[PDB]
Design an enzyme around this catalytic site. Structure first.
Site, PDB file in Angstrom:
ATOM      1  N   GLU A   1      -5.687 -10.124   0.528  1.00 26.37           N
ATOM      2  CA  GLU A   1      -6.598  -9.882   1.638  1.00 26.37           C
ATOM      3  C   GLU A   1      -8.031 -10.028   1.170  1.00 26.37           C
ATOM      4  O   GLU A   1      -8.379  -9.564   0.103  1.00 26.37           O
ATOM      5  CB  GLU A   1      -6.411  -8.471   2.173  1.00 26.37           C
ATOM      6  CG  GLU A   1      -5.603  -8.388   3.441  1.00 26.37           C
ATOM      7  CD  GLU A   1      -4.597  -7.275   3.396  1.00 26.37           C
ATOM      8  OE1 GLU A   1      -4.897  -6.185   3.930  1.00 26.37           O
ATOM      9  OE2 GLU A   1      -3.509  -7.500   2.832  1.00 26.37           O
TER      10      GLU A   1
ATOM     11  N   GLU B   1       0.800  -1.229   0.000  1.00 22.09           N
ATOM     12  CA  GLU B   1       0.000   0.000   0.000  1.00 22.09           C
ATOM     13  C   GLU B   1       0.833   1.280   0.000  1.00 22.09           C
ATOM     14  O   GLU B   1       0.637   2.148   0.849  1.00 22.09           O
ATOM     15  CB  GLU B   1      -0.940   0.036   1.208  1.00 22.09           C
ATOM     16  CG  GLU B   1      -2.045  -1.001   1.209  1.00 22.09           C
ATOM     17  CD  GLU B   1      -2.888  -0.958   2.456  1.00 22.09           C
ATOM     18  OE1 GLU B   1      -2.651  -0.081   3.313  1.00 22.09           O
ATOM     19  OE2 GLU B   1      -3.793  -1.809   2.578  1.00 22.09           O
TER      20      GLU B   1
END
Ligand SMILES: OC[C@H]1O[C@@H](SCCc2ccccc2)[C@H](O)[C@@H](O)[C@H]1O
Ligand SMILES: OC[C@H]1O[C@@H](SCCc2ccccc2)[C@H](O)[C@@H](O)[C@H]1O
Ligand code: NA
Ligand code: NA
Ligand code: NA
Ligand code: NA
Lengths: 409, 205
Positions: B127, B51
């Site tokens: 995820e 991220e």
């Protein structure tokens, strides 16, 4: 029997035996060239010419005059009886189902003085049909196919087609948000293509080959001795309907399994006409003889597990390892009687998934024949009502409308 | 095995990862990891980070791992999980049927994502299924899709264990603390606990 027109044609001694029309475009789609190849049956001589002119209504946008003779193509040279005329067209109108925009091209063979020996004409539509990055494209735009399969049928006249019934069907189709029509499973009336050009309907021209009754289905199509017969059913179709703009897709046939003849015939069409993608359903609709994945009645979520030829979900089929080709259902949603249940599922998936560019509904019109009671009153007959056995009863009627033709709910 | 790089707080998320001056720092977080854990059989996949958006540093660092170790595929989620810095498509919490329409970085359906024009890479959710408190609703949908679709090779559930800290009452009895229980602000409250089990560790339902 003789179910189509019979006619006599008189040609001159020196004739235009054949002519082709193609359209090339710049990447901006703002500049188009019309390359027209012209063949003659001669009686060849030096003085005679061929003039190709493009007309938009009463206005001529372009013209081309050139002596016969082709460019050198081999050590022996080029065709002496052929000529190539490419006409520059600036900012042309593009043909589509939404906006027709037809052009009129006049091809005439004339002496150099000059008197015209023979005059030929053709309707030209400027569009491009090419699959790119695994997407069927028209004029640089991905086209969502909202089409329906159509049989040449008349309840009163059998398979004889009048002009009024061809118009009647086309209007009803467009009035019900149909932009495409799949002539299944044979080359249609030459006038049907003409009507589709002017009204604006995407047409998938299908070859007259179907060996569904054989065991296995590809017994004849994988037979080298039957190759000569199958090729003539494909080659002669392409030669007749390659000029029509409305036709965008060639088809090898229907259910004929997958044989070596299909791959060869597929390669032939790609060779003679790279302008149109070639699709074929047999062999699992994922064979090497098709440019598009065209499964029959495949489902949206659940997938039918069959040996040899498995029918996957239209969403799953795209995601298979090594799949790039788009998916257009040649047949789906069997409209037999009270149907189109879960029809909204297909079109939710069509709009969501880019590579899912719609499909063709089966069928358009019920193939029911009209019979008469002892009292004289007419009634719709199907399957085994004509004392025929073995038959497939009411399965002949799978149309979205009746035969008169009244719309089904 | 995932590299220690995450710049989620930056605006934009790739402000540092698209900065050439920060490349030397990011590379040392990746290179030193590979050198240490390349012998372990259990490790099968390298990861660039989490991220951090998509920058030029990621593509360079991705290419470096492929150069030193072609044995393991390299995945990275940032930039839409379909960037050139990943061997696998690894979207976060992407859904099975409905797809979140976001500008720049769109989250597609796991079924739709595979079918996108020019897609060949498999999809493994780095995820998915946020197990925060009472969750895993519609969890059966994912695994019905995993078994049906060949290129859908499952994913990684978030999370395994609640990151709750133990504190003590005035009476002395211990109690689970989360987020802003340690007099810390600004905080993200109970979002720290997304595990499939407690911390003791007792299994959640
Ligand atoms: O209703 C006809 C349909 O038959 C099925 S096969 C088997 C389906 C069938 C077979 C025998 C009788 C009735 C239906 C074809 O796939 C369709 O294109 C269409 O022709
Ligand atoms: O619950 C944490 C999750 O946050 C979301 S972003 C925004 C979600 C969020 C932001 C602020 C407070 C609570 C949740 C991340 O994508 C997940 O990996 C996980 O870290
Ligand atoms: Na689509
Ligand atoms: Na039928
Ligand atoms: Na799978
Ligand atoms: Na969290």
């Amino acid at each position: 029997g003789i179910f189509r027109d019979v006619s006599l044609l008189h040609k001159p001694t020196t004739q235009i035996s054949d002519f082709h029309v193609a359209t090339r475009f710049n990447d901006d789609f703002s500049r188009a060239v019309l390359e027209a190849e012209v063949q003659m049956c001669g009686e060849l001589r030096d003085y005679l010419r061929v003039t190709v002119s493009l007309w938009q209504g009463e206005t001529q946008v372009a013209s081309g005059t050139a002596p016969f003779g082709g460019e050198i193509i081999d050590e022996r040279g080029g065709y002496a009886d052929r000529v190539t005329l490419r006409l520059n067209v600036e900012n042309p109108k593009l043909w589509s189902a939404e906006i027709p925009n037809l052009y009129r091209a006049v091809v005439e063979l004339h002496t150099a003085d000059g008197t015209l020996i023979e005059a030929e004409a053709c309707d030209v539509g400027f569009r491009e049909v090419r699959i790119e990055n695994g997407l069927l494209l028209l004029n640089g735009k991905p086209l969502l196919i909202r089409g329906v399969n159509r049989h040449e049928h008349h309840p009163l006249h059998g398979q004889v087609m009048d002009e009024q019934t061809m118009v009647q069907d086309i209007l009803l189709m467009k009035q019900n948000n149909f932009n495409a029509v799949r002539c299944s499973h044979y080359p249609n009336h030459p006038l049907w293509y003409t009507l589709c050009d002017r009204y604006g309907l995407y047409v998938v021209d299908e070859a007259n080959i179907e060996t569904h009754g054989m065991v296995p289905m590809n017994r004849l199509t994988d037979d080298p001795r039957w190759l000569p017969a199958m090729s003539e059913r494909v080659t002669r179709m392409v030669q007749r309907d390659r000029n029509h703009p409305s036709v965008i897709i060639w088809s090898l046939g229907n259910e004929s399994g997958h044989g070596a003849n299909h791959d060869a015939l597929y390669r032939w069409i790609k060779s003679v006409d790279p302008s149109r993608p070639v699709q074929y359903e047999g062999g699992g609709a994922d064979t090497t003889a098709t440019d598009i994945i065209c499964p029959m009645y495949a489902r949206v979520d659940e997938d039918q597990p069959f040996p040899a030829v498995p029918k996957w979900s239209i969403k799953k089929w795209l995601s298979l390892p090594g799949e790039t080709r788009p998916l257009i259902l040649c047949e789906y949603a069997h409209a037999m009687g009270n149907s189109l249940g879960g029809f909204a599922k297909y079109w939710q998936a069509f709009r969501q998934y880019p590579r899912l560019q719609g499909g063709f509904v089966w069928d358009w019109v019920d193939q029911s024949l009209i019979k008469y009671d002892e009292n004289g009153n007419p009634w719709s007959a199907y399957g085994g009502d004509f004392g025929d056995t073995p038959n497939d009863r009411q399965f002949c009627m799978n149309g979205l409308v009746f035969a008169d033709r009244t719309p089904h709910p």
